[PDB]
């Protein structure tokens, strides 16, 4: 019990990224951002978060990467607001996956995310 | 000098947290490298104590005497090294929560600065690249 898992490196957490068609939604104090101009590619959801009692406790950062490594989505707690809950993170992932799949994107979650707060069930990818 | 002052002050805290994480990480690796060093020597002292008293049992049915003191000296050094090896296991056991909490709050400060406008080149300067 009580751990801290990191799918991303310091570069991946701090890398600058740009959205052509920015879309921002809010789930609690978590900010969900994604580029609506992304379509027909395989996207992986990588996240850094702490666990406790084998449940996801607190999310540090979540970002969506394409196969080539570009950042196209993000979930992060808002800096000016207090924290979030286990349920808030799952709702945020559902919003990001649902919004990313509306543009025919094949979104997948990492192995650690699949263990504590996953979604989707996934669709087919295009070559 | 207002909202940026908070960004600069928090970015300074990110430096201190980064140093402390790397300072305790460097300390944790010295304890682990020395821990496995002593436990390997505890192993060697152990089977050497075996072959010591096994040279007694193998030739006590027939009957080479001052060898008993060498075995007593080894058993003395064994539990003296195992005692210090236990202290090393206790020192770095109290560091894992320190390393985990420092790493988590370092990442949270990095993310907070990202949400406040600090680009990647700013983050690397506070992180020492």
UniProtKB/Swiss-Prot annotation, chain A:
| Major localization listed first in the record, in broad terms | host cell
Residue positions of motif Nuclear export signal? 52-61
Name a GO CC annotation attached to this entry. host cell cytoplasm
Reported modifications of this chain? Upon interferon induction, ISGylated via host HERC5; this results in the impairment of NS1 interaction with RNA targets due to its inability to form homodimers and to interact with host EIF2AK2/PKR.
Q: Which UniProt keywords apply?
A: Eukaryotic host gene expression shutoff by virus, Host cytoplasm, Host gene expression shutoff by virus, Host mRNA suppression by virus, Host nucleus, Host-virus interaction, Inhibition of host innate immune response by virus, Inhibition of host interferon signaling pathway by virus, Inhibition of host PKR by virus, Inhibition of host pre-mRNA processing by virus, Inhibition of host RIG-I by virus, Inhibition of host RLR pathway by virus, Interferon antiviral system evasion, RNA-binding, Ubl conjugation, Viral immunoevasion
- Cellular compartments annotated: Host nucleus; Host cytoplasm
Q: Which GO terms describe its biological process?
A: symbiont-mediated suppression of host cytoplasmic pattern recognition receptor signaling pathway via inhibition of RIG-I activity; symbiont-mediated suppression of host gene expression; symbiont-mediated suppression of host mRNA processing; symbiont-mediated suppression of host PKR/eIFalpha signaling; symbiont-mediated suppression of host type I interferon-mediated signaling pathway
Q: Which GO terms describe its molecular function?
A: protein serine/threonine kinase inhibitor activity; RNA binding
- Where is region (CPSF4-binding) located? 95-127
According to the record's subunit comment, the protein's assembly and interactions are: Homodimer. Interacts with host TRIM25 (via coiled coil); this interaction specifically inhibits TRIM25 multimerization and TRIM25-mediated RIGI CARD ubiquitination. Interacts with human EIF2AK2/PKR, CPSF4, IVNS1ABP and PABPN1.
| Extra remark | South Carolina isolate has been sequenced from formalid fixed-lung tissues of a 21-year-old male which died in 1918 at Ft. Jackson, SC. Brevig Mission isolate has been sequenced from lung tissues of an Inuit woman buried in the permafrost in a gravesite near Brevig Mission, Alaska. This sample was recovered by John Hultin, retired pathologist.
Which family does the record assign? Belongs to the influenza A viruses NS1 family.
Sum up the protein's function in the record's words. Inhibits post-transcriptional processing of cellular pre-mRNA, by binding and inhibiting two cellular proteins that are required for the 3'-end processing of cellular pre-mRNAs: the 30 kDa cleavage and polyadenylation specificity factor/CPSF4 and the poly(A)-binding protein 2/PABPN1. In turn, unprocessed 3' end pre-mRNAs accumulate in the host nucleus and are no longer exported to the cytoplasm. Cellular protein synthesis is thereby shut off very early after virus infection.
Q: What is known of its domains?
A: The dsRNA-binding region is required for suppression of RNA silencing.
By what name is this protein known? Non-structural protein 1
Organism equals Influenza A virus (strain A/Brevig Mission/1/1918 H1N1)
Swiss-Prot record, chain B:
Superkingdom of origin = Eukaryota
Residues in the signal sequence:
none
- Phosphotyrosine sites (modified residues): 32
PTM note says: Phosphorylated in response to signaling from activated receptor-type protein kinases. Dephosphorylated by PTPRJ. Ubiquitinated. Polyubiquitination by the SCF(FBXL2) complex probably promotes proteasomal degradation of PIK3R2.
**What family does the database annotate?**
Belongs to the PI3K p85 subunit family.
Give the record's subunit note.
Heterodimer of a regulatory subunit PIK3R2 and a p110 catalytic subunit (PIK3CA, PIK3CB or PIK3CD). Interacts with AXL. Interacts with FLT1 (tyrosine-phosphorylated) and FLT4 (tyrosine-phosphorylated). Interacts with NYAP1, NYAP2 and MYO16. Interacts with FBXL2; PIK3R2 is a substrate of the SCF(FBXL2) complex. Interacts with PTPN13; dephosphorylates PIK3R2. Interacts with XBP1 isoform 2; the interaction is direct and induces translocation of XBP1 isoform 2 into the nucleus in a ER stress- and/or insulin-dependent but PI3K-independent manner.
| Entry's free-text remark on domains | The SH2 2 domain is required for interaction with FBXL2 and PTPN13.
What does the UniProt record say this protein does?
Answer: Regulatory subunit of phosphoinositide-3-kinase (PI3K), a kinase that phosphorylates PtdIns(4,5)P2 (Phosphatidylinositol 4,5-bisphosphate) to generate phosphatidylinositol 3,4,5-trisphosphate (PIP3). PIP3 plays a key role by recruiting PH domain-containing proteins to the membrane, including AKT1 and PDPK1, activating signaling cascades involved in cell growth, survival, proliferation, motility and morphology.
Disease per record:
Megalencephaly-polymicrogyria-polydactyly-hydrocephalus syndrome 1: A syndrome characterized by megalencephaly, hydrocephalus, and polymicrogyria; polydactyly may also be seen. There is considerable phenotypic similarity between this disorder and the megalencephaly-capillary malformation syndrome.
Protein name (Swiss-Prot/TrEMBL):
Phosphatidylinositol 3-kinase regulatory subunit beta
The gene from which this protein is expressed is: PIK3R2
